[PDB]
Write a protein that binds this ligand. Structure first.
Ligand SMILES: O=C(O)CCCCCCCCCC(=O)c1ccc[nH]1
Lengths: 424, 202, 101, 50, 556, 202
C-alpha cells in the first residue's frame, strides 16, 4: 500500500505528438490522427492495402546515431521499436528533472512491453556482411530491455514482456510491485509498437475486422470495427515518500493495480464480462480505495460491436451501484482520437488522465452520435462524456481508473490520484 | 506413517484413458510399479491424483499376484475374472429396486438364505455399513424384543420367509445397503418396491 | 445385483459398483480404502498416442552441390526447341558491387 | 503366415470407391467404421463471440 | 535516415498476375519466336489440376483449351480470336506431391497474321519434354454472325435432371471435380442434344477477365461426356471461335449431329453469341487405360477380427412390432429359442424342414425341395393367418450331418446346404420384403482365423449367401453370427440383442463369452521378396487349371 | 526428473548428431556441428488436448511442448486438472519467437493461414495454457535470453508472496525449429569443435 509517483512521461503517438502537452492539444481540440499509408518504408504491398487507413508515426525511419554513441551500421540493424524506447527514455529522465549522468549506477529497474516486429524480413537480398553481425541483438525481444540499461548504466532488474495489447498495463503492474517489494529505487515502465511489415494490417483487412473509415468510434451506436495504429511511451516511477525526500516533481500517483485471465467456458455467460467485474474489485482492494471515490474511467473502448457493450455492462455491475448524488461515473476513451495503439494503450490513457488532472477538465469522446444500444443506460449512474466537463481541485480527492482488454484473455485495471501538491 | 497391520482385503484399482490403445499402454506402465508398492497405496493414489476420462477399466484383487494377472489381461486385451471394461455415456438416469422378505418362499428359498448369509461379511469389510445396520437394529428392538438382534447377526432362512422377524431383518438390511450405496455416491433418480418391502423404497 | 456376486463378499459389491462406474456413474471409491492403512505414491503419467504435426513434409536425404551457380554464368535454361544452350542471370543491386570489383 | 491370417488376399483396390459403387443406402461394418459416440469440443483459443 | 532497404518510387506499374499455366515470358535475344516457362510447386497443383480420374490429379480439357488461347492472345489487345486444327494428345497427370514443370512457345508461320502455338509437359530427372497440345492461331475474325436467340426458348424438347445425378453419372465414369469446376446449375438432356445453365465459372484468375473461359469450355466437355456411356476424354477440336470474356451467367447448347463429333455454342444472358466450337471428338480416346492412371498401390488385404470388449453389452430387443420366425436343423433348438423369446415377452413361431420329423409341434416348410415357389406358397399361409414378421433366424447344425449320414463329401454337402438355405431365404424375401424384415444367418465353425478348432468347409455357402444379400437387396438389414461348433450355444436374447445394435449389415462371431466383429484392413506388401527369390534348381514345378493368358505369364 | 537422474548418475552426456525429419535447408553450413536435441518434437497428439490437427500443425513447437509438459506437472503435483478449472493460478513462461512459419518454402494452404497468428505470437504462449486448463490468474510471457527461466521464477515467487494468487506455474521452452542460431554460432566459431560444455575445466 505505498503509493507510487509518476515523476515524468515521454511518448511518441500518431499525428505529430512528442509530449504530454501535444496529446492534450490534440484531444482538447477534438481532432483525430488516422490517415493514409506511409511512404518511405520499404513496403511493396499489392492491392491488399488499397483503401486501408490507420495511425502511423511519420519519421520512425529516422534516428540520430551519434547522440547515443552507435555506429550508423548498428543503428540500421536495430528494430525501430528498440530505437523509439531509447529516444523516449532520455526525454522521460529530462522531464522528470534527473540528469542522465546522475542516473548511472542507480538501482533503476526496467520493464518494457515489446512485440516482435519482423524488421529483417524487409530485405529482398541477403544482408551486407557488416550488418549481418549486428542483426541478432538488434532484433531479439530480450535485448530491448537490456539496451536501455546498458546505455543509461542502470544496475537494477531488466525484463521484456509480451501479453498482446495489455503489454503496457502488465509491464506497469510488475514495476509497481517491484517498487513496493523494495527491490529498486526507481522503475522505468512502458513499451513500443511500430509496423515495420504491413502483414498485421493485411491480416485484419482479409478478415474484415477494421472499421471502413478507420475510426474506433468508442462506445458509440455506429460501432463499425477496430483501427490499428502505432505508438511508443515510457513512464518513470518512484515511491511517493522517496520522491518527497528528494523533492522531484509528482505528476500523478498510482494507487492500486490488478491482472486476470477471462478463462475458458461457453461465450453465452459473457466470460470476458465476469473477468472485468473481478479485476475491477481486485484493483480497488489493492489500493484500499472505496468504489464511491472514483470520478471517471478511461475505458478500453476499442469499437468491437459486442465488446464495448460487455465493458459498459461490467462498469454498471461494479462502480455504478454506489454513486453519490450528482457524481455519476464519467466514461471515455483516448482510442477515439488516435486509434487502438496496440501494445501502448495503457500509456496513451495515463497521458490523457495526467493531463486532465493538471488542467482541471475532462475531454470529450469524439464521433459519439448516440450511446451503444447493447447495454442498459437506464440507471443514469454512468454516462459517456459527450461534452467536456470541469474537474477542479477541492475537498473531494480526485481519482480515475484505466482499463485494457485483449483477445488472448488478459484484462487489467489501474487507479490514479492527484499529486498532493503542497503550496509553494 | 504409524501404519496398521491388516488381512489381505480386496483393492479396487481404477484406470481411465481418452482412447482404447492408451488404456492398454497404461496397463503396461502400471504393471511394473504394482510389484514395488503395496496395492492399497497404489489404488488410493489412482483414485485421487488422476482424472475421470471416457474409456474406463476396473481391476479387483486381494494382493499383488492377482492384480498383476488383471493388469496383464488388460495389457494383452483378454477377458478374465475381476477385470471390467467399457465406454462411459455421461447422463445419470439411474433407478433402484427394493424387495420384501416373503417372496423368497415362492421358489429356491435356500438361495435367499445364502445371499443374506453372504451379506453378513460386509460388516467387517466396509466402515459405512456397520454403523447404519447397527442404528437400524437397535432402533427396531424397542418394537420387537431382543430376538431381532440375534436374527440380524444370524441372517438364515427368516430373510426369505413371511414372518415379523423376517420382514424386520429385510428392512434392516435394505436400509443399510441404501446408506452403503449413497456413501459410494450412487444417487437414485427413481425407486420401486415389490411387495411388503415398499417401505424401504419410500 | 448389488449384494450378489463372486464368493468373497467385498468382490461382489466392488464388481457391481465397478460396472456402474464403467457405464458412467461418478462412483466415489473412497469407502473401499477408508479405515485401511493407505498412503500416496508417485505413479507413471499418461501415455500419448503421437502422430506427425509439422508444416513441412520430410525432406529426402539426397546429397547435392553446395553453391554451384557461377556469379555471371547463372542458370542454364532447358528451352526444348533450342539449337544450343542459353544461360541467364539477374544481379540485384547489392550483388553488383561484389562482382564488379 | 503359418496361422491366424484369416481370409487374406493381394490386389490394388480403393475401398472408398468400392462401397459407393453399385449403390448402398445403409452402413456395412466390414468396410465402414462402426459408430459415433457422445463427446464435445471447445470453441478454440482467441474466439470469444456471443 | 536509418533503415535497411531504400524507399519505393512514388508511382509504379501494376505488374499484373500471370495465368498459372503459362507463367512469365522468357527474353532470349536471337530466338525466332517467344517462349514461356513455369514450375508448379506441390501445393499449387491442387488448384490448377481441378479434376481427378481414379484419384490421380489431371488437367481439365477446358483448361488445356484456355492455355492455348492465353498463349495465342498474349501479344495484342484484340477482343475476338480463332483457333483451328486443335489437337490435345494424351493425359497431363501429376502423382500426389510431385513437382510439375511446364513450357509453351509461339512461332510465326510466315503466312501473314498466321501463328502456331505449342505446349509441352514436365521434363524431370531421366525423363524429357513431350508434346501435350498444339493449335494454329488466326487473329482478327472480322466476320458477321447471327442475331439474338432467346435462351429461355432452348430447353423445350428435353427432360430436366438434378445436378446431383449429373455429377453422379460422371463419378461412374471415373471422374470427380473440385468445387471451382462444379459450374452447372440446371441441365436438360435427351436424344442427340443437351442444354444447360452455367454459373460464374471462377477458376484461379477467373473472378474477372478472360480466364473464366477455362471452366465455361470445361462445362462443354462435362455435358458432351454426359450423353455417352463408358469412360472417354477429349482429343481434337477442328474450330474454336471466341469473342470477349464470358458474362457472369451463360447458356450452353451441345449437339451430336456430326459423325462421331459434337458441336457446341455459348450464349449470353441476353442471347448474344459468345463462342462456338465445332468437331469436338472424344471417340479416339474412348476407353483409354485406367491401370496406368490409377493412384492406388499393391497391398495385402485381410479380414481381421476385433473383439467388442469396448461397449459389448446387448441392449434391448425393439418392442412388439411383429413376430420372429425361427428355423433350424434341430426341432429341439427351434423350440428352445421359442421358449426363451416367450420368457422375454417377444412373440415367436417355430419352423422345421419337412424331411425332419414334426417332433415338437412346429410349422413345416418344404425346404429340401429346391424351389422358392412351394416355399413361398407356405410362407403366404402365415400372412393369411394374419401373422406379421419382424425378422427371421436360420440356424445350422454344423458337423452333425457327418455322423448322421455316415459318409464324407464336403462338396456335395456344400451343394445341399446352399440349396436348402437358398430355398428358405428366397421364399421368405418374395413374401415379406415390403415389411422391411431383418434376416439373421447363424452358422457354426464358419469363421476363419479365430482361435478354437478348424473351420468346417461345408459351412461355406452361408458366408457366400450373406454377402450375396448385402449387395443385392441393399434396403434389408441382415447379419451373420458364427457360433463355436463345440461349446454350448448362447441365449437367443444375447444373439438378437447385439444384432439389433447394427443398422444395415455386419459379420459377428462368438468364441467363449466374447463377441467379435470382422473388418477388412490393409498393410504394405514386400514384392521385393520375389525380386530376391529364385526357385530351387533340383526340382519340377506345376502350373495347373488355367487358360492360355494366365498360363503363359505363370510360365514366364 | 528420474530420467535426468539416471543420465547424470551414470555419468553420461547427451550432445549428438543433427536432427533428421525436420525440413532443414542446411547445406555445408552445419557440416560437422553437434548439439543436444529433443528427438521427435515434430510428433504430438491433437485429440488429447481438443485441437483439430490443422491448428496443431499451425502452432510453434514451443507452445506444444509447454502444453504437454504442464499436464505432466499437474499429474505429479497430485492435482487432477479437472479440479484446477476455476483456480486462481498464475502463468509465467520464459519463451522466444521461434520463426517456425519461415520453414514454409511456399505460401500456406488457406485452411492453416488463419491459425498461424495466435499459433506463433509469443504473447499467445501464456494465454493458451490458461485457456486449456481454465486458469483465472495473470498470464505473461517474459524474455531476457538465457536467464528467461530465472526471471519467470522470480516474478512467480514475488506474486505468491504478495497474495495475488493461490498457485503459480513458472518455466519455459526452447526448440530449434529453424537452424539459423546454430549456423551463426558456427559461423563466428563460438562452438566447441567436439560439442561439449566442459563446464569449469582447463
Ligand atoms: O543468453 C544467452 O547467452 C543465450 C542467447 C540465445 C539467444 C536466442 C535468440 C533467438 C531469437 C530468434 C528470433 O527472434 C527469430 C528467429 C527467426 C526470426 N526471428
Amino acid at each position: 500500500q505505498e503509493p507510487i509517483a509518476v515523476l515524468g512521461i515521454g511518448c511518441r503517438f500518431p499525428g505529430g505528438v512528442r509530449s504530454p502537452e501535444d496529446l492534450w492539444d490534440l484531444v482538447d481540440s477534438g481532432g483525430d490522427a488516422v490517415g493514409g499509408l506511409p511512404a518511405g518504408r520499404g513496403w511493396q504491398a499489392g492491392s491488399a492495402l488499397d483503401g486501408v487507413n490507420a495511425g502511423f508515426i511519420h519519421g520512425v525511419e529516422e534516428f540520430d546515431p551519434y547522440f547515443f554513441g552507435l555506429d550508423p551500421v548498428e543503428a540500421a540493424a536495430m528494430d525501430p521499436q528498440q530505437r523509439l524506447l531509447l529516444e523516449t527514455t532520455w526525454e522521460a529522465f529530462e522531464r522528470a528533472g534527473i540528469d542522465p549522468v546522475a542516473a548511472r549506477g542507480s538501482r533503476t529497474a526496467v520493464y518494457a512491453g515489446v512485440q516482435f516486429g519482423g524488421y529483417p524480413l524487409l530485405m529482398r537480398e541477403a544482408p551486407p556482411p557488416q550488418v549481418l553481425d549486428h542483426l541478432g541483438l538488434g532484433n531479439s525481444v530480450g535485448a530491448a530491455s537490456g539496451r536501455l540499461a546498458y546505455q543509461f548504466g542502470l544496475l537494477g532488474g531488466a525484463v521484456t514482456v509480451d501479453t498482446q495489447c495489455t503489454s503496457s498495463i502488465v509491464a506497469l503492474h510488475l514495476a509497481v510491485k517491484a517498487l513496493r517489494n523494495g527491490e529498486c529505487a526507481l522503475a522505468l515502465a512502458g513499451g513500443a509498437c511500430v509496423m515495420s511489415l504491413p502483414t498485421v494490417l493485411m491480416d485484419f483487412h482479409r478478415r474484415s475486422l477494421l472499421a471502413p473509415d478507420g475510426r474506433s468510434k468508442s462506445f458509440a451506436a455506429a460501432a463499425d470495427g477496430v483501427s490499428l495504429a502505432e505508438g511508443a511511451g515510457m513512464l518513470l516511477l518512484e515511491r511517493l515518500s522517496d520522491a518527497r525526500r528528494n523533492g522531484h516533481p509528482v505528476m500523478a500517483v498510482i494507487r492500486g493495480t490488478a491482472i486476470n485471465q477471462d478463462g475458458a467456458t461457453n461465450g453465452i455467460i459473457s466470460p470476458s464480462g465476469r473477468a472485468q467485474e473481478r479485476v475491477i474489485r481486485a484493483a480497488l482492494a489493492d489500493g484500499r480505495v472505496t468504489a464511491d471515490s472514483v470520478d471517471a474511467v478511461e475505458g478500453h473502448g476499442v469499437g468491437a460491436t459486442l465488446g464495448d457493450g460487455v465493458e459498459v455492462t461490467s462498469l454498471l455491475s461494479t462502480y455504478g451501484q454506489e454513486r453519490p448524488a450528482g457524481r455519476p461515473l464519467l466514461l471515455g476513451s483516448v482510442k477515439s482520437n488516435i486509434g487502438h495503439t496496440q501494445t501502448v494503450g495503457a500509456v496513451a490513457g495515463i497521458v490523457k488522465l495526467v493531463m486532465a488532472l493538471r488542467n482541471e477538465r475532462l475531454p470529450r469522446t469524439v464521433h459519439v452520435d448516440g450511446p451503444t444500444p447493447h447495454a442498459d443506460w437506464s440507471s443514469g449512474t454512468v454516462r459517456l462524456l459527450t461534452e467536456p466537463e470541469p474537474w477542479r481541485r477541492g475537498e473531494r480527492v480526485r481519482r480515475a481508473g484505466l482499463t485494457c482488454l485483449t483477445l488472448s484473455g488478459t484484462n487489467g485495471h489501474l487507479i490514479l490520484e492527484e499529486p498532493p501538491a503542497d503550496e509553494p | 506413517a504409524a501404519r496398521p497391520a491388516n488381512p489381505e482385503r480386496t483393492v479396487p484399482l481404477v484406470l481411465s484413458a481418452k482412447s482404447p490403445t492408451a488404456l492398454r499402454e497404461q496397463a503396461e506402465r502400471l504393471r511394473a510399479t504394482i510389484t514395488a508398492a503395496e496395492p492399497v497405496d497404489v489404488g488410493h493414489s489412482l483414485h485421487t491424483t488422476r482424472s475421470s476420462f471416457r474409456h474406463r477399466a476396473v481391476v479387483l484383487g486381494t494382493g499383488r499376484e492377482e492384480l498383476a494377472a488383471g493388469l496383464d489381461a488388460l495389457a494383452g486385451d483378454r477377458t478374465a475374472d475381476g477385470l471390467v471394461r467399457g465406454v462411459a455415456r455421461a447422463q445419470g438416469q439411474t433407478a433402484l429396486l427394493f424387495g420384501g422378505a416373503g417372496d423368497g418362499t415362492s421358489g429356491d428359498r435356500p438361495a435367499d438364505a445364502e445371499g443374506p448369509r453372504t451379506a453378513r461379511g460386509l460388516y467387517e469389510a466396509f466402515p459405512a455399513f456397520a454403523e447404519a445396520l447397527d442404528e437400524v437394529t437397535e432402533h427396531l428392538a424397542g418394537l420387537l424384543g431382543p430376538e431381532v438382534r440375534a436374527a440380524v447377526r444370524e441372517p438364515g432362512p427368516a430373510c426369505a420367509e413371511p414372518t415379523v422377524v423376517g420382514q424386520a431383518v429385510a428392512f434392516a438390511l435394505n436400509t443399510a445397503l441404501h446408506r452403503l450405496l449413497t456413501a459410494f455416491a450412487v444417487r437414485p433418480d427413481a425407486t420401486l418396491g415389490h411387495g411388503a418391502g415398499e417401505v424401504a423404497a419410500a | 445385483s448389488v449384494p450378489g456376486g463372486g464368493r468373497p463378499p467385498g468382490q461382489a459389491l466392488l464388481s457391481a459398483l465397478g460396472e456402474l462406474h464403467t457405464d458412467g456413474v461418478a462412483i466415489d471409491w473412497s469407502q473401499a480404502f477408508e479405515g485401511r492403512g493407505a498412503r500416496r505414491v508417485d505413479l507413471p503419467t499418461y501415455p500419448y498416442q503421437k502422430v506427425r504435426c509439422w508444416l513441412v513434409p520430410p525432406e529426402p536425404q539426397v546429397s547435392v552441390v553446395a553453391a554451384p551457380p557461377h556469379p555471371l554464368l547463372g542458370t542454364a535454361l532447358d528451352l526444348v526447341d533450342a539449337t544450343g544452350q542459353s544461360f541467364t542471370q539477374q544481379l540485384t543491386p547489392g550483388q553488383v558491387a561484389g562482382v564488379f570489383g | 503366415e503359418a496361422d491366424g491370417s484369416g481370409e487374406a488376399g493381394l490386389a490394388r483396390v480403393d475401398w472408398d470407391r468400392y462401397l459407393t459403387a453399385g449403390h448402398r443406402p445403409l452402413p456395412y461394418t466390414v468396410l465402414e467404421t462402426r459408430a459415433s459416440y457422445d463427446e464435445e469440443k471447445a470453441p478454440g483459443f482467441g474466439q470469444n463471440r456471443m | 535516415r536509418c533503415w535497411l532497404v531504400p524507399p519505393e518510387p512514388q508511382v509504379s506499374v501494376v505488374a499484373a498476375p500471370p495465368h498459372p499455366l503459362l507463367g512469365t515470358a522468357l527474353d532470349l535475344v536471337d530466338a525466332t519466336g517467344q517462349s514461356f516457362t513455369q514450375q508448379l510447386t506441390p501445393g499449387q497443383v491442387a488448384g490448377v489440376f481441378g479434376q481427378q480420374l481414379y484419384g490421380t490429379p489431371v488437367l481439365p480439357a477446358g483448361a488445356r483449351l484456355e492455355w492455348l488461347l492465353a498463349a495465342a492472345r498474349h501479344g495484342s489487345p484484340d477482343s475476338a480470336w480463332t483457333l483451328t486444327g486443335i489437337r490435345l494428345p494424351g493425359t497431363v497427370s501429376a502423382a500426389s506431391g510431385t513437382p510439375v514443370a511446364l513450357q509453351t512457345s509461339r512461332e510465326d508461320s510466315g503466312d501473314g497474321h498466321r501463328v502456331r502455338a505449342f505446349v509441352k509437359g514436365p521434363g524431370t530427372g531421366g525423363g524429357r519434354w513431350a508434346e501435350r497440345g498444339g493449335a494454329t492461331v488466326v487473329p482478327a475474325v472480322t466476320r458477321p454472325a447471327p442475331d439474338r436467340v432467346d435462351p429461355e426458348s432452348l430447353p423445350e424438347g428435353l427432360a430436366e435432371l438434378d445436378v446431383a445425378e449429373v455429377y453422379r453419372r460422371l463419378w461412374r465414369q471415373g471422374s470427380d471435380y473440385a468445387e471451382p469446376l462444379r459450374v452447372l446449375r440446371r441441365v436438360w438432356l435427351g436424344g442427340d442434344e443437351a442444354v444447360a445453365l452455367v454459373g460464374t465459372a471462377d477458376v484461379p484468375t477467373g473472378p474477372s477477365g478472360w480466364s473464366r473461359w477455362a471452366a465455361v469450355l470445361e462445362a462443354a466437355v462435362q455435358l458432351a461426356a454426359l450423353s455417352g456411356s463408358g469412360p472417354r476424354t477429349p482429343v481434337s477440336v477442328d474450330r474454336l471461335e471466341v469473342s470477349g470474356p464470358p458474362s457472369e451467367v451463360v447458356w450452353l447448347r451441345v449437339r451430336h449431329g456430326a459423325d462421331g463429333a459434337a458441336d457446341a455454342v455459348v450464349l449470353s444472358g441476353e442471347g448474344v453469341r459468345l463462342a462456338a466450337v465445332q468437331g469436338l471428338r472424344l471417340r479416339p480416346m474412348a476407353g483409354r487405360e485406367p491401370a496406368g492412371l490409377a493412384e492406388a498401390p499393391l497391398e495385402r488385404h485381410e479380414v481381421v477380427w476385433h473383439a467388442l470388449a469396448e461397449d459389448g453389452r446387448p441392449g434391448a430387443i425393439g418392442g412388439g412390432t411383429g413376430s420372429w420366425l425361427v428355423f433350424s436343423d434341430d426341432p429341439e433348438r427351434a423350440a428352445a429359442w421359442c421358449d426363451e423369446l416367450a420368457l422375454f415377452g417377444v412373440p415367436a413361431v417355430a419352423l422345421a424342414g419337412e424331411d425332419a420329423e414334426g417332433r415338437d409341434g412346429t410349422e413345416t416348410v418344404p425346404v429340401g425341395t429346391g424351389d422358392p415357389d412351394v416355399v413361398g406358397k407356405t410362407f403366404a399361409e402365415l400372412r393369411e393367418r394374419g401373422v406379421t414378421v419382424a425378422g427371421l433366424l436360420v440356424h445350422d447344425a454344423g458337423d452333425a450331418r457327418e455322423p448322421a449320414s455316415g459318409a464324407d463329401d464336403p462338396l456335395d454337402a456344400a451343394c445341399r446346404r446352399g440349396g436348402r438355405t437358398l430355398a428358405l431365404v428366397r421364399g421368405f424375401l418374395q413374401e415379406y420384403a415390403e415389411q422391411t424384415p431383418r434376416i439373421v444367418l447363424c452358422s457354426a465353425g464358419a469363421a476363419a482365423g479365430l482361435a478354437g478348432g478348424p473351420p468346417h468347409p461345408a459351412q461355406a455357402p452361408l458366408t457366400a449367401l450373406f454377402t450375396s444379400l448385402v449387395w443385392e437387396h441393399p434396403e434389408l438389414p441382415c447379419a451373420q453370427v458364427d457360433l463355436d461348433p463345440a461349446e454350448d450355444p448362447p441365449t437367443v436374447v444375447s444373439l438378437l440383442g447385439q444384432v439389433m445394435r447394427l443398422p444395415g449389415a455386419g459379420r459377428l462371431a462368438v468364441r467363449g463369452g466374447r463377441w467379435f466383429e470382422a473388418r477388412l484392413e490393409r498393410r504394405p506388401a514386400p514384392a521385393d521378396r520375389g525380386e530376391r527369390l529364385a526357385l530351387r534348381p533340383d526340382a519340377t514345378y506345376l502350373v495347373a487349371g488355367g487358360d492360355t493368358r494366365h498360363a503363359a505369364a505363370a510360365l514366364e
